[PDB]
Design an enzyme around this catalytic site. Structure first.
Site, PDB file in Angstrom:
ATOM      1  CG  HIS B  10      -2.032   1.203   0.889  1.00  0.00           C
ATOM      2  ND1 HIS B  10      -2.234   2.184   1.839  1.00  0.00           N
ATOM      3  CD2 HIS B  10      -2.803   1.542  -0.173  1.00  0.00           C
ATOM      4  CE1 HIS B  10      -3.103   3.066   1.376  1.00  0.00           C
ATOM      5  NE2 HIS B  10      -3.469   2.696   0.161  1.00  0.00           N
ATOM      6  NE  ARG B  46      -5.655   2.988  -3.475  1.00  0.00           N
ATOM      7  CZ  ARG B  46      -4.893   2.055  -4.040  1.00  0.00           C
ATOM      8  NH1 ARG B  46      -4.394   1.056  -3.317  1.00  0.00           N
ATOM      9  NH2 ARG B  46      -4.626   2.131  -5.335  1.00  0.00           N
ATOM     10  CB  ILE B  69      10.532  -1.661   4.954  1.00  0.00           C
ATOM     11  CG1 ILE B  69      10.783  -1.382   3.464  1.00  0.00           C
ATOM     12  CG2 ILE B  69      11.811  -1.605   5.778  1.00  0.00           C
ATOM     13  CD1 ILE B  69      11.615  -2.430   2.769  1.00  0.00           C
ATOM     14  CB  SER B  70       8.563  -1.720   9.416  1.00  0.00           C
ATOM     15  OG  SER B  70       7.550  -0.850   8.927  1.00  0.00           O
ATOM     16  CE1 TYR B  71       5.608  -9.434  10.698  1.00  0.00           C
ATOM     17  CE2 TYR B  71       7.948  -9.309  11.288  1.00  0.00           C
ATOM     18  CZ  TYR B  71       6.860 -10.033  10.795  1.00  0.00           C
ATOM     19  OH  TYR B  71       7.043 -11.346  10.411  1.00  0.00           O
ATOM     20  N   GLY B  72       4.696  -2.928  10.653  1.00  0.00           N
ATOM     21  CA  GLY B  72       3.772  -1.866  11.046  1.00  0.00           C
ATOM     22  C   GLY B  72       2.351  -2.401  11.004  1.00  0.00           C
ATOM     23  CG  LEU B  73      -0.236  -0.014  13.335  1.00  0.00           C
ATOM     24  CD1 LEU B  73      -0.634   1.473  13.212  1.00  0.00           C
ATOM     25  CD2 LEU B  73      -0.575  -0.589  14.730  1.00  0.00           C
ATOM     26  CG  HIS B  74      -0.531  -0.690   6.577  1.00  0.00           C
ATOM     27  ND1 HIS B  74      -0.679   0.330   7.493  1.00  0.00           N
ATOM     28  CD2 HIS B  74      -0.943  -0.192   5.386  1.00  0.00           C
ATOM     29  CE1 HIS B  74      -1.162   1.398   6.882  1.00  0.00           C
ATOM     30  NE2 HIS B  74      -1.329   1.108   5.604  1.00  0.00           N
TER      31      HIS B  74
END
Lengths: 126, 125
Positions: B10, B46, B69-74
């Protein structure tokens, strides 16, 4: 030869892990000895070190600035070149910042290695 | 078994981001590594969201790969929400509407990413 530096530019805000990943890549490259020095910085937001800072503290002849980004989003075409007084837009940009030579590289996104990163997320070799 | 793959990203209303996602699907589609390759999107609404992408695929197993790249909330939150999968870090495999699904880890920590950086400088090929 010339003194070669590298700055890994990212942005993922106040996340423990995001920084930890950025670090991991700096560590790995630092230990590889591919460069005389490796530093991380951050675009768009104001958080520290901004890229003008990271460059300032490096005593290299040439410094490669690499955007740890998938797309040419504003961060890469707008903010980052703004924060160094570099032309906006797509593509490699080389010029000078405070009497050092700087090259802003392309973001990693389109690289075959990214393609393989995806595949390896499934395959998980090593 | 019939093997599918879903590249989840995203980066919102950006021509290029989609185009990059496409490039990778195209590359992998052409590689023949998988029986089918689809792209979808997390957090925002989307299209296609990942429940859709999975539904149109007639595979036995489906690998969901977060182009992140990261373990973010997404990745720890939204995506496993959007398929009724447990939240958090790590590989997650279960089932969605009677197909086996595996949620893989985000690409960020991979050695290939490290090398994507280096190759931004070295620019081999």
């Amino acid at each position: 030869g010339m003194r070669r530096g590298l700055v890994i530019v990212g942005h993922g805000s106040q996340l423990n892990h995001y920084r930890e990943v950025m670090e991991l890549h700096r560590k790995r490259i630092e230990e590889s000895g591919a460069f005389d020095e490796v530093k991380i910085a951050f675009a768009a937001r104001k958080r520290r070190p901004m890229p003008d800072e990271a460059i300032r503290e490096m005593n290299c002849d040439i410094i490669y600035v690499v955007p740890l980004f998938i797309s040419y989003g504003l961060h890469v075409t707008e903010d980052l070149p703004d924060l160094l007084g570099f032309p906006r837009g797509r593509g490699i940009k080389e010029g000078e910042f405070e009497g050092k030579k700087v090259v802003i590289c392309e973001p990693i996104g389109e690289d075959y290695f990214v393609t393989y990163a995806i595949l390896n997320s499934v395959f998980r070799i090593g």
